[PDB]
Design a protein around this motif. Structure first.
Motif, PDB file in Angstrom:
ATOM      1  N   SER A 148       5.379 -18.034 -63.378  1.00 19.86           N
ATOM      2  CA  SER A 148       7.319 -18.532 -62.850  1.00 19.86           C
ATOM      3  C   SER A 148       7.505 -16.551 -63.089  1.00 19.86           C
ATOM      4  O   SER A 148       8.587 -16.600 -62.340  1.00 19.86           O
ATOM      5  CB  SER A 148       7.594 -19.035 -64.174  1.00 19.86           C
ATOM      6  N   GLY A 179       9.881 -16.173 -59.377  1.00 17.46           N
ATOM      7  CA  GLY A 179      11.016 -16.484 -59.877  1.00 17.46           C
ATOM      8  C   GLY A 179      11.202 -15.012 -59.826  1.00 17.46           C
ATOM      9  O   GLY A 179      12.700 -14.889 -59.807  1.00 17.46           O
ATOM     10  N   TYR A 180      11.399 -13.779 -60.030  1.00 22.90           N
ATOM     11  CA  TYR A 180      11.611 -12.979 -60.684  1.00 22.90           C
ATOM     12  C   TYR A 180      11.099 -11.618 -59.906  1.00 22.90           C
ATOM     13  O   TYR A 180      11.371 -10.760 -59.223  1.00 22.90           O
ATOM     14  CB  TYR A 180      11.817 -12.861 -62.157  1.00 22.90           C
ATOM     15  N   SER A 233      22.428 -14.523 -58.581  1.00 25.48           N
ATOM     16  CA  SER A 233      22.705 -12.663 -58.715  1.00 25.48           C
ATOM     17  C   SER A 233      21.784 -12.358 -59.659  1.00 25.48           C
ATOM     18  O   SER A 233      21.181 -12.597 -60.722  1.00 25.48           O
ATOM     19  CB  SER A 233      24.087 -12.311 -58.860  1.00 25.48           C
ATOM     20  N   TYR A 234      21.301 -11.185 -59.575  1.00 31.93           N
ATOM     21  CA  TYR A 234      20.471  -9.913 -60.317  1.00 31.93           C
ATOM     22  C   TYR A 234      20.686  -8.666 -60.593  1.00 31.93           C
ATOM     23  O   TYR A 234      21.819  -8.691 -59.886  1.00 31.93           O
ATOM     24  CB  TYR A 234      18.686 -10.205 -60.416  1.00 31.93           C
ATOM     25  N   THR A 258      11.334 -11.812 -70.671  1.00 28.69           N
ATOM     26  CA  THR A 258      11.975 -12.793 -70.970  1.00 28.69           C
ATOM     27  C   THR A 258      11.321 -13.512 -71.139  1.00 28.69           C
ATOM     28  O   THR A 258      11.580 -14.734 -72.426  1.00 28.69           O
ATOM     29  CB  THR A 258      12.934 -12.895 -70.110  1.00 28.69           C
ATOM     30  N   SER A 312      11.061 -17.578 -74.398  1.00 33.00           N
ATOM     31  CA  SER A 312      10.207 -18.782 -74.426  1.00 33.00           C
ATOM     32  C   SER A 312       9.079 -19.164 -75.583  1.00 33.00           C
ATOM     33  O   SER A 312       9.183 -19.817 -75.738  1.00 33.00           O
ATOM     34  CB  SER A 312      10.009 -19.310 -73.519  1.00 33.00           C
ATOM     35  N   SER A 369      10.322 -24.081 -71.371  1.00 24.05           N
ATOM     36  CA  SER A 369      10.796 -22.716 -70.181  1.00 24.05           C
ATOM     37  C   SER A 369      12.394 -23.011 -69.736  1.00 24.05           C
ATOM     38  O   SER A 369      13.593 -22.201 -69.970  1.00 24.05           O
ATOM     39  CB  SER A 369      10.378 -22.145 -69.830  1.00 24.05           C
ATOM     40  N   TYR A 370      12.148 -24.007 -69.393  1.00 23.81           N
ATOM     41  CA  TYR A 370      13.458 -24.992 -68.301  1.00 23.81           C
ATOM     42  C   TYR A 370      14.461 -24.601 -69.079  1.00 23.81           C
ATOM     43  O   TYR A 370      15.127 -25.286 -68.906  1.00 23.81           O
ATOM     44  CB  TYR A 370      12.653 -26.098 -67.489  1.00 23.81           C
ATOM     45  N   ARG A 416      20.326 -12.949 -72.209  1.00 24.53           N
ATOM     46  CA  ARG A 416      19.262 -13.670 -72.649  1.00 24.53           C
ATOM     47  C   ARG A 416      18.058 -12.826 -72.799  1.00 24.53           C
ATOM     48  O   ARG A 416      17.359 -11.887 -71.398  1.00 24.53           O
ATOM     49  CB  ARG A 416      18.598 -14.733 -71.027  1.00 24.53           C
ATOM     50  N   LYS A 464      22.087  -6.736 -70.588  1.00 20.59           N
ATOM     51  CA  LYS A 464      23.071  -7.271 -70.077  1.00 20.59           C
ATOM     52  C   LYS A 464      23.428  -8.640 -69.809  1.00 20.59           C
ATOM     53  O   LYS A 464      22.907  -9.339 -70.791  1.00 20.59           O
ATOM     54  CB  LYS A 464      22.395  -6.929 -68.827  1.00 20.59           C
ATOM     55  N   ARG A 517      22.935 -12.256 -67.376  1.00 23.54           N
ATOM     56  CA  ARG A 517      22.916 -12.910 -66.645  1.00 23.54           C
ATOM     57  C   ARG A 517      24.008 -13.673 -66.382  1.00 23.54           C
ATOM     58  O   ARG A 517      24.426 -14.640 -67.154  1.00 23.54           O
ATOM     59  CB  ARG A 517      21.814 -13.041 -67.256  1.00 23.54           C
ATOM     60  N   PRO A 549      11.033 -24.763 -61.744  1.00 22.48           N
ATOM     61  CA  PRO A 549       9.852 -24.420 -62.175  1.00 22.48           C
ATOM     62  C   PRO A 549       9.194 -25.196 -61.015  1.00 22.48           C
ATOM     63  O   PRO A 549       7.820 -24.706 -60.863  1.00 22.48           O
ATOM     64  CB  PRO A 549       9.627 -25.006 -63.344  1.00 22.48           C
TER      65      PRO A 549
HETATM   66  O1  ZNT Z   1      15.581 -18.298 -61.864  1.00 18.58           O
HETATM   67  P1  ZNT Z   1      13.562 -18.757 -62.323  1.00 18.58           P
HETATM   68  O2  ZNT Z   1      13.136 -18.945 -61.149  1.00 18.58           O
HETATM   69  O3  ZNT Z   1      13.505 -16.914 -63.264  1.00 18.58           O
HETATM   70  C1  ZNT Z   1      11.175 -17.276 -63.976  1.00 18.58           C
HETATM   71  C2  ZNT Z   1      11.347 -16.468 -65.227  1.00 18.58           C
HETATM   72  O4  ZNT Z   1      12.067 -14.801 -64.057  1.00 18.58           O
HETATM   73  C3  ZNT Z   1      13.094 -14.182 -65.200  1.00 18.58           C
HETATM   74  N1  ZNT Z   1      14.164 -13.465 -64.516  1.00 18.58           N
HETATM   75  C4  ZNT Z   1      14.703 -14.659 -63.540  1.00 18.58           C
HETATM   76  N2  ZNT Z   1      16.017 -14.027 -63.063  1.00 18.58           N
HETATM   77  C5  ZNT Z   1      15.960 -12.611 -63.391  1.00 18.58           C
HETATM   78  C6  ZNT Z   1      17.401 -12.426 -63.905  1.00 18.58           C
HETATM   79  N3  ZNT Z   1      17.615 -11.434 -63.133  1.00 18.58           N
HETATM   80  N4  ZNT Z   1      17.319 -11.113 -65.248  1.00 18.58           N
HETATM   81  C7  ZNT Z   1      16.332 -11.258 -66.128  1.00 18.58           C
HETATM   82  N5  ZNT Z   1      15.190 -11.383 -65.474  1.00 18.58           N
HETATM   83  C8  ZNT Z   1      14.411 -12.663 -65.363  1.00 18.58           C
HETATM   84  C9  ZNT Z   1      13.394 -15.094 -66.684  1.00 18.58           C
HETATM   85  O5  ZNT Z   1      12.001 -15.019 -67.606  1.00 18.58           O
HETATM   86  C10 ZNT Z   1      13.362 -16.265 -65.944  1.00 18.58           C
HETATM   87  O6  ZNT Z   1      12.852 -17.317 -67.108  1.00 18.58           O
HETATM   88  P2  ZNT Z   1      13.592 -18.004 -68.193  1.00 18.58           P
HETATM   89  O7  ZNT Z   1      13.323 -17.650 -69.841  1.00 18.58           O
HETATM   90  O8  ZNT Z   1      15.014 -16.379 -67.900  1.00 18.58           O
HETATM   91  O9  ZNT Z   1      14.056 -19.337 -67.104  1.00 18.58           O
HETATM   92  C11 ZNT Z   1      12.739 -20.887 -68.287  1.00 18.58           C
HETATM   93  C12 ZNT Z   1      13.382 -21.310 -66.806  1.00 18.58           C
HETATM   94  O10 ZNT Z   1      15.026 -21.599 -66.219  1.00 18.58           O
HETATM   95  C13 ZNT Z   1      15.150 -21.145 -64.890  1.00 18.58           C
HETATM   96  N6  ZNT Z   1      16.553 -20.982 -64.666  1.00 18.58           N
HETATM   97  C14 ZNT Z   1      16.841 -20.176 -65.122  1.00 18.58           C
HETATM   98  C15 ZNT Z   1      18.392 -19.338 -64.612  1.00 18.58           C
HETATM   99  C16 ZNT Z   1      19.071 -20.019 -63.964  1.00 18.58           C
HETATM  100  O11 ZNT Z   1      20.060 -19.370 -63.748  1.00 18.58           O
HETATM  101  N7  ZNT Z   1      18.264 -21.464 -63.285  1.00 18.58           N
HETATM  102  C17 ZNT Z   1      17.057 -21.789 -63.134  1.00 18.58           C
HETATM  103  O12 ZNT Z   1      16.629 -22.435 -62.589  1.00 18.58           O
HETATM  104  C18 ZNT Z   1      13.985 -20.171 -64.664  1.00 18.58           C
HETATM  105  O13 ZNT Z   1      12.837 -20.509 -63.313  1.00 18.58           O
HETATM  106  C19 ZNT Z   1      12.676 -20.076 -66.150  1.00 18.58           C
HETATM  107  O14 ZNT Z   1      11.856 -21.334 -64.922  1.00 18.58           O
END
Ligand code: ZNT
Lengths: 181, 182
Positions: free
Chosen positions: A10, A14-15, A83-84, A111, A115, B10-11, B76, B80, B82, B112
């Motif tokens: 993931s 996803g990142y 947005s990142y 991150t 979890s 995680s979600y 998170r 920064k 998010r 997920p």
């Molecule tokens: O959006 P996800 O696919 O992210 C998975 C995982 O990648 C890291 N991540 C993603 N974007 C990030 C930014 N902009 N900064 C830092 N890190 C980033 C994260 O570790 C993320 O896992 P998670 O602990 O943040 O979240 C768990 C679970 O929730 C989903 N999620 C998160 C934020 C959102 O806005 N929508 C969403 O569906 C995450 O999927 C993740 O599966």
């Protein structure tokens, strides 16, 4: 399979697979950081003891947050643009003669490890303390294997495993050591 | 444990437990959607077969994207903040006499499930076609019982499992059916 396998995949799909190829372009767009960041790669922190992911600038007078890179939209998702942005940290290595060497790095915590900490601490936990520590090691090893075979991420990341509690002041010395050679 | 068990937690910890307590507050701040949204809850889509989420408005003329709510800045695990932002969809149900009833829902896919599809898709995949399908079912089962015992999320979510391939036109009918219930 395992709990860590899902978190590492993931984290990649996803990142990391999305932002690492975009990393050199984000720094070029920033007219304030394009000449300040020489190591155009994401330094990922992999804490092993603590998981609160405290700000690294609070544990070292040489480390100072100096702002964020311009944000970018990732089209990956379902009818919602996310947005990142990346935070830039300034590292100032002092010298006994009064001189300084100023650096800039993109440093972030892994991150998903946060979890793993949330599953074990609360009551009726999915994992116990010992069962979580094993997943932390499997996560670090799995994330290394994934990024090692990812051809679009080669040469755009660094993995820094450490005990994320009393030795956050070691980050500044490690980043400069990776920058010099 | 299982791949799905980790993604479900995680979600929950990484997203749902963060944005569902903020959802009630975030709607009332939007002067444009504070009264247009009467279902102050998140509708989570759970595709079972097809995971190419695409866009929900392209498969239904009664569904239309009409903007977002004000974003929520949350630290998170980093220095920064998010960005966590919800998208509001317009759903207009036609009637044979020319009249319409217009609703506004906050609907988005369960991210997920996209990662599970991405695992089995590329070469050297850990998950096979059969192993992915089993983890998709376990994820839906696990995410349901986690949200069923959560006090911070009670009354703030709805779970909508569907195929995802051609059932995308059925989402508008399910949302209005769940609204007419409440
Ligand atoms: O959006 P996800 O696919 O992210 C998975 C995982 O990648 C890291 N991540 C993603 N974007 C990030 C930014 N902009 N900064 C830092 N890190 C980033 C994260 O570790 C993320 O896992 P998670 O602990 O943040 O979240 C768990 C679970 O929730 C989903 N999620 C998160 C934020 C959102 O806005 N929508 C969403 O569906 C995450 O999927 C993740 O599966």
């Amino acid at each position: 399979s395992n709990v860590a396998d899902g978190l590492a995949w993931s984290y990649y799909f996803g990142y990391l697979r999305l932002v690492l190829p975009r990393l050199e372009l984000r720094i070029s767009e920033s007219e304030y950081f394009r000449h300040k960041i020489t190591d155009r790669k994401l330094f990922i922190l992999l804490p092993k003891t603590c998981f609160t992911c405290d700000d690294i600038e609070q544990a070292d007078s040489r480390v100072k947050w100096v702002g964020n890179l311009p944000e970018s939209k990732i089209n990956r998702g379902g009818i919602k643009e996310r947005s990142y942005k990346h935070a830039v940290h300034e590292i100032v290595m002092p010298f006994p003669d009064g001189t300084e060497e100023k650096y800039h790095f993109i440093v972030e915590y892994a991150t998903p490890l946060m979890s793993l900490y949330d599953m074990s601490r609360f009551t009726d936990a999915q994992l116990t303390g010992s069962e979580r520590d094993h997943q932390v090691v499997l996560f670090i090893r799995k994330l290394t294997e994934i990024l090692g075979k990812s051809e679009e991420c080669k040469g755009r990341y660094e993995l820094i495993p450490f005990s994320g509690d009393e030795d956050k002041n070691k980050i500044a010395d490690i980043l400069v050591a990776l920058h010099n050679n």
